[PDB]
């Protein structure tokens, strides 16, 4: 549920030592009154909202991949070329040298350039009334009327938590030399 005035909206501040700015409208999902540096006063809110959502989804996929590749789950035949170890950095370097990550880079960049760049440009220019992070992708049909929130808010919160989790896991792998779990 949208819980405007409890979880989002005007008047909600989760870290009350930094007062809620007047710049935040409360329309954006995840607006919980945290802008100490006042960035919302001068940036375009739609662009940074879509950037936060895309960074969050990338960090979710990164967390899922890091945990399944550091625990030991692998595809059939995937261990041989990419090394029978569990260290994510060496997995990156081996899969680059194999050519897998160039192929991933090519297709992710093709997806980014072909529809992502026009979606961001038309969304910012005001030609489609497209919302940030809305790429119209609902294959399984799980949000129809619950899209207002209990889908958006939980996604952005898990995105931010995934960002913090992936950063923590990477810097632990740097300092310790051993992957998580």
């Amino acid at each position: 549920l949208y819980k405007d005035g409890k979880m989002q909206g005007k008047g909600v501040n989760i870290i009350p030592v930094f007062a809620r700015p007047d710049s935040l409208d409360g329309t954006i999902p995840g607006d919980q009154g945290f802008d100490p540096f006042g960035f919302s006063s001068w940036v375009n809110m739609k662009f940074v909202s879509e950037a936060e959502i895309k960074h969050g989804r990338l960090a979710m996929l990164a967390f899922a991949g890091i945990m399944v590749e550091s625990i030991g789950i692998s595809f059939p035949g995937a261990t041989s070329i990419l090394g029978d170890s569990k260290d994510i950095f060496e997995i990156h370097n081996k899969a680059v040298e194999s050519g897998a990550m160039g192929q991933i880079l090519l297709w992710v960049g093709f997806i980014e350039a072909c529809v992502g760049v026009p979606a961001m440009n038309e969304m910012l220019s005001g030609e489609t009334s497209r919302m940030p992070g809305d790429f119209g992708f609902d294959p399984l049909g799980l949000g129809k009327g619950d899209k207002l929130a209990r889908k958006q808010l939980v996604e952005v919160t898990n995105g931010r938590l995934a960002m913090l989790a992936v950063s923590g896991i990477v810097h632990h792998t740097i300092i310790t030399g051993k992957g998580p779990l």
């Binding site: 350039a113 072909c114 529809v115 760049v117 026009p118 979606a119 038309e122 030609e127 489609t128 497209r130 809305d134 790429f135 119209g136």
Partner: protein
């Protein structure tokens, strides 16, 4: 007012649905820069050349004309090109395709004027499309097969660059 193929993007203004294969797919707005008649002529020419090249790669894998094996030897796909530049075949091919493409240039500029549909050379000597509906069905099939053969011939020549097998030989040997 949204694109049918890419539902989160707007319908391009140069696209209308009249041309065969129009599903509102122009996310990068190439039709906003170039003329749609020039673009459709280019798409049909690329597609028809790619259908011919795909069918040629398949049939030259399957069999060879009499006498080509002596001059060429065991050279296949793009590897014949340089050899057949030293021989006189491709110079003849370029000469007659250039002769056809002069009138192709006149037809394309006539289309850019706006008195002729792009890719309409009125070449139907067997009169296949008598009623307009079958004409529409062949137009959609032609543009879809042309795009599919563009991708296919790209895959075939780059797979030849990787393994040097051939589109049917690579199927018959991993």
């Amino acid at each position: 007012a949204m694109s049918d193929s890419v539902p989160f993007l707007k319908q391009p203004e140069a696209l209308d649905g009249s041309m065969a294969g129009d599903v509102g797919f122009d996310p990068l707005g190439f039709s906003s820069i170039g003329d749609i008649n020039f673009l459709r002529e280019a798409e049909l020419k690329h597609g028809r050349i790619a259908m011919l090249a795909a069918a040629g790669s398949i049939a030259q894998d399957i069999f060879t004309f009499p006498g080509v094996s002596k001059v060429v030897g065991t050279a296949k796909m793009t590897g014949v090109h340089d050899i057949l530049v030293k021989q006189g075949a491709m110079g003849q091919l370029l000469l007659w395709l250039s002769f056809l493409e002069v009138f192709g240039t006149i037809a394309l500029l006539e289309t850019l004027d706006g008195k002729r549909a792009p890719g309409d050379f009125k070449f139907d000597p067997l009169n296949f499309s008598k009623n307009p509906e079958t004409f529409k069905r062949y137009q959609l099939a032609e543009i879809k097969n042309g795009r599919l053969a563009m991708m296919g011939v790209g895959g075939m020549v780059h797979g030849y660059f990787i393994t040097g097998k051939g589109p049917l030989e690579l199927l018959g040997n991993f």
